[PDB]
Amino acid sequence: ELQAIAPEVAQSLAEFFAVLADPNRLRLLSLLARSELCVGDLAQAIGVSESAVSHQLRSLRNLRLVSYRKQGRHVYYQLQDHHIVALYQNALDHLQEC
Amino acid sequence: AIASELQAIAPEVAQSLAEFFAVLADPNRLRLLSLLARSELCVGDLAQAIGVSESAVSHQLRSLRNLRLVSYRKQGRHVYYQLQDHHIVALYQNALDHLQE
């Protein structure tokens, strides 16, 4: 009764994990996993230029990993959905338990 | 609001996490995990479902066992493989749901 996931679905999933296999991206996600933040907050926490942060976020926006929202004078970034938060926490928990 | 009290994960932890995801960036490993996510199975079952030799499945499993992604148990004459823990099942499903939504 069991069937594996279609090869096209397996390929997309593989590409998704490949995109997450980048330390800098993960450090950015680790902050957003706890709170939505502006480019200025992210820059300071990472110790890099706002300019550099905007470039990385541009990439994450298109990969559908992050999204943003306006709130008067500030643009706040956050993870795309709760799944990203959940897979990030679980990956981390597995690592610590092994 | 809580921006001040926030620190990013350590660079060494970010590197390990990155390597973990890299290991999952393989279609064949994903197809194998997708079967184990629904049921613990023997090499013969896994081979039949994927359409390859038991020999090939054993090789891939050897890799997953060492990567701490899968484990096994002997129940008499059979060896049943299963996912290492619930976190693997959880991260697998969440990534899959994200992709569809």
UniProtKB/Swiss-Prot annotation, chain B:
Keywords assigned by UniProt, alphabetized: DNA-binding, Metal-binding, Repressor, Transcription, Transcription regulation, Zinc
Record bears the keyword Ribosomal protein: no
DNA-binding positions: 43-62
Superkingdom to which the source organism belongs: Bacteria
Positions contributing to Zn(2+) 2 binding: 98, 101
Functional summary from the UniProt entry: Transcriptional repressor of the expression of the smtA gene. Binds two zinc ions per dimer. The complex of DNA and SmtB is dissociated by zinc ions.
Protein name per Swiss-Prot or TrEMBL: Transcriptional repressor SmtB
Organism name: Synechococcus elongatus (strain ATCC 33912 / PCC 7942 / FACHB-805) (Anacystis nidulans R2)
Gene from which this protein is expressed: smtB
